[model samples]
Each structure stands twice: as structure tokens, then as C-alpha cells.
Target: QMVLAPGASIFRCRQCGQTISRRDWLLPMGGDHEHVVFNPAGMIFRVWCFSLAQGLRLIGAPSGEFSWFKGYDWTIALCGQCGSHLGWHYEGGSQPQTFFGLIKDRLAEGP
Candidate 1:
């Protein structure tokens, strides 16, 4: 597991007024690149990560497998209360290993 510095700043949910951690993100892609072509089958639209530290992962959508004609797809998971676009999921190439949250303020120290 990767550990970030305690001083690191991350994006907060503007709607719910909650802080977003990297573990609270998910990848709903077959691969990486954001341009891969695959048959859409086992897809759900709910978050399903096993642990809180792992946050939540994408488990397809209610629409089921996406149609090829739709091109690449993007899904935004927002806070239930505030409806902030907390994060998004896309499909294409290998999934990203790390998630970077948006920073509202400038960093005090350069990494």
C-alpha cells in the first residue's frame, strides 16, 4: 500500500462539504488508455469496494453492459447529500494505479 504525507492536500466535496481521500475512488474501466474496445457485460453502477480504506470501486451501471456505439464512457459519482462530482470512472487502457484529488488551495511546499 502507498502512503501519502500527512501534509498533503486533496480535493473536498463541494456539495457534501466532505474531504475526499484517494481510497474513496474507483476505476470502472476494462483497461487503461481510455480507448480500449471490449464486450460490455459485467457492469453495474454502484460503488463496491470491500474496505473503507479501499474506498469504493465501480461495479457497472444499471444500464448493464454499455453499447459499442457509445464510444468511451464516463461516470460521475457524486455525494448523495450535496451532489458534488466527487470522482469519475472511465474505460480504455490499464486502470490508473493512483488517484489524485483536486486541490483548492496552492501547495505550501513543492513535492
Candidate 2:
């Protein structure tokens, strides 16, 4: 697990300072584990995640479409403030759940 400052509450985009998520509400996927993956376009991204994320705009099908990630059809996640490509919104699993795999280098702790 990652240690956080007391009362720290949000994650923001490093490029544009857009608020990405509230810390307390986010469900960490792998306790500080991080890795790299490629998108359908073959762009590489170093990603980490919470089981859920907020404050992002999903582009692509409402039902999502497959990319490089398995089991989850993905939609592009864009920063609502500056249109930066932060990561992806993924859906489809044995139990219905949403996961957002975000670029760790593109994010920062805030508030």
C-alpha cells in the first residue's frame, strides 16, 4: 500500500492540474504495484490504478471496445480540464466493475 499524507484527498493531472480522483474514495488495485501496457494504437504507457476513478471523460463506445488490455473493453479517458489523455476506462469482468488504469507519471497528489 502507498502511504499518504494525513488529510490528503485528491489526485491531479501533472500536465494540466486537473483533479482526477479523491483519495479516500479510490480503490487501489495493487497496493503500489505499477506496470506498463500498450494501447490499440501501440502507444506505450506506464500505468497504475484504483479500482474506480472519477472526473474523466470517456470517449468511444458506451459499451467500450477491446484494445490491448484483456477482459476489459476500454474507452479513452481524457482530462475534463485540458483534454490530456490520462488513461482508460475499462469495463467487463466476471463481476461487473469499472477500473481506470492511469498513467502514474501523469498524476500527482493534491489537496
Candidate 3:
């Protein structure tokens, strides 16, 4: 119903009240961390990348099918609580240890 984890900034799964990530985890990728993109389908998605994220349920096996980032293998990320398709976790690219893409509309922010 409200913000969880008192921080400078935080995000939660809008579908259900559950912690998704914090602002500190945010990282720059594809130039910027925040982006409004249309991929695969005409439906646009507001995507944000993070270097680290917790309280997520991972799904699916590794595959380069729809890799959003070049040289990175991505896995689906689900809400730890509601089990909704939030975004994905990308791994690979020697320089970048971790990467996560979260859907903007699927999450609400607190500051």
C-alpha cells in the first residue's frame, strides 16, 4: 500500500506492494540509465537499468534470443511478491558484472 525501506529513493512493483530496488543500485547503460524504448512489439516500454537489485524471483534459462544489451545474456526477472513480469537481469560483458532492466509502468517510485 505504501513505500517500503526508507531511503533517498526506492521503487516498488505497482501491481502489488513489494520492494523492487533502490536508487543507489541504478547504473548507466546504453548511455543513460533511464530510457523509453519500443522493442520487439509496437508497445513502448520505459526501461531502467540497475547494477544491483534484490528481492527478485529469477526465471527462464540463459538465451540470447531477445538480448537487450549486446554481449550480455539476460534472464527474466519477476516480482518477489506478486510474481509479475517486471523486467530482466543481464549478465556477461566482462566490464559489467550485473545489469537489470525494470519496467517503468510496472513500478512506482518513492523518495
Candidate 4:
């Protein structure tokens, strides 16, 4: 398990160097690992880490059904600054929470 100093981490867009999320708004979740997921449209993505909260500004409308996780819908997440495809957002699951599945290769960690 990786422990980060309080307010020491930030998530940024790898493509355009745009800040996407910060530690203050993030809640560490799931064991860090390379996560491979797919959408109904047969799009496959390899996500790096998972986190709850840390709200992100989405580019377009979310498109997903409750097929994967009951009561939860998902949408493609993009970088607000560069319009780069960053990851996906999941909301309304059995737990009243939201999650952001970020692509590790698409994100940068720094001071």
C-alpha cells in the first residue's frame, strides 16, 4: 500500500499538462493496480488506480446503463483544459458515492 503525505499528490493530464484533480478532494480507494475495463461499446481501457470523489469537469454527457454495476451509470471523462480522454466516471451504485477510474499512463504525479 502506498501512503501519500497529506495534500502532497496531484493528478494531471499527461497529454497537455493540465491539472485534473488534487489530493484534498480525493479519497484513496481500491488496491492500486493496473485495472483493465471495458464499456458496452466494446471499448477497452487499462486504468491504473481507482479513487472515490475528486470531482472532475466532464466534457460530454455520460453514456452508460446499469448493466455493469446495478444502479450505477458511467461516462467518459476528459481533461477540461486539453480535451484529452483521461478516464471514466461511475456514479449511483449501491453505495451513494462516485468514482473516477483514471488511466495511469494519462496521468502525472508531481509536486
Candidate 5:
């Protein structure tokens, strides 16, 4: 329902200052772009969904166990530059297209 356009608010990695994603990449699900999700470890995350993102280093085997979103396996994601733990990369099992759930606290919105 949105077009990916040139970014205005550039998002960068808070740990190492690398471009992660921008405003245009943001995508809304459940009528919003932001969602609060909990993990099996009981940790809470205020995550933002993005249709596109970059500078990611994914690790570990994609596991479906305790997935925050149904039918999508999650892999631990890190900043490609500084190896800062960013968030999870949600792989498409049901939707057939990948999306990212980036931790909003780990990202800085820049102009």
C-alpha cells in the first residue's frame, strides 16, 4: 500500500553509525509499523517492520521455535559494520517474501 521512495529520515545503526534503513522502507502491518513483541526469554522488543533494509549480518540457523510472527523463521541479526546485535530477520514461510523486525532502540533516526 506504499511505495518505496527516497528516504528523508535516514536510519543508522546506533552502535557504529552505519546506514541500516530509512523512512521509505518502513512498512505497516496490522495497521501500524510498530509493534511490541515478546520472546520466549521474556524480553520485550518494540520492533518496527521494514519492507527493505541493509547492512545486516544474519547468524545462527533459522529457527521457527517461539517465533514472534507465525510461519516466519527468525534468525539473529547484527550490524554488518560493528557486529552490534540489531534484531531478527524474519524469513517468509507463509508470505514468500522476507521482512525485517528491527529494534527501534538500536536505531537512530537521522536527517
Candidate 6:
């Protein structure tokens, strides 16, 4: 059970400032493996933010631009419905891998 801190939050796109929901944060894995899949370009809604006194708030705007890479890895994925940029690939540390997921649902808004 990975739970976010009370104030911890996930911002939407850095360019458009759209919001992403927490449910969208969860990635879905095709098939029946009960696996928590992460889609770097997944759609997301309802932005998340850390509030010192109010817990989490959907007030902070997103960064807008897609998170190209996590550390040094390329995070990639795309929206299946709109074919929009669902995710991207970037360098991750020393390994060339994709290690970041995004709220695919949030791409509807432009960045």
C-alpha cells in the first residue's frame, strides 16, 4: 500500500497546467496478473498538491510539459484514444530505461 503523504501531490502538465486525479496515477496492466501498471503517458485528471494544513489540494497547477525522463531514463507511453503524447522516453540514471508514468487522461488539455 503505497500511500502519498498528506500534503504530497502530483502536478499536471507543466505547459497547460491541467490537473490529474489520483486514480489516474494508477497504471493498468493488460491481462489478469493483478499487476499495477504505470503508463507514463496515461490520462489523468484532478491535480494533486501538498498542503501544510489542508492535507492535499488540487490547487497547484501542473508543470504542463510531459516528464521526458525520470532521473536519466526515458519515460514513454501514449494515449490510445487520441494518439496524443501519453508519455516520453528519457535517460534514467546509468541505465537506458523508461521509469516514469503519467496521467494519460490529462492530455486532453494542451500544454
Task: Compare the candidates by TM-score and give the number of the best one.
Answer: 5
Q: Tens digits of per-residue lDDT for model 4 on 37-111? A: 776688777765455524355665665653344465678777777777787787766433676767767777766
TM-score list, all predictions: 0.32, 0.71, 0.82, 0.64, 0.86, 0.24
Q: Rank the candidates by TM-score, best first.
A: 5, 3, 2, 4, 1, 6
Model 2 C-alpha lDDT per residue in residues 10-56, reported as the tens digit of each score: 77888888778766645444444365766568877887766767678
Stretches of candidate 1 exceeding 4 Å from the true structure: 1-8, 22-72, 95-111
Better of 5 and 6 by TM-score: 5
- Per-residue lDDT tens digits for candidate 6, residues 1-111, read 875464424444434443432332332222121222333577433221111111112222334244322344333333333344434323333332322344344433222
Off by over 4 Å in 3: 1-8
- Assess candidate 5 and give its lDDT: 0.85
Q: In model 2, which residue pairs have backbone atoms overlapping below 3 Å?
A: none
Off by over 4 Å in 4: 1-8, 22-34, 40-43, 49-55, 66-70, 94-96
What candidate 5 gets wrong by more than 4 Å, as runs, is: 1-8, 94-96
Which candidate leads the pack in lDDT? 5
State which candidate, 3 or 4, has the greater TM-score.
Answer: 3
Better of 3 and 5 by TM-score: 5
- lDDT accuracy of residue 44 in candidate 4: 75
lDDT of 2 at 70: 51
lDDT of 5 by residue, 41-88 (tens): 888899998877899999998988888776788899899999999898
The clash numbers for all candidates, in the given order, read: 14, 0, 0, 0, 0, 40
Residue pairs with backbone overlap in model 5 = none
Query: What lDDT tens digits, residue by residue, belong to model 1 across residues 11-87?
Result: 34444445444322423334321223343564432232111111223334522144332333444445444554443
Q: Alpha carbon lDDT of residue 25, candidate 6?
A: 37
RMSD of 5: 5.2
Off by over 4 Å in 6: 1-70, 89-91, 94-97, 103-111
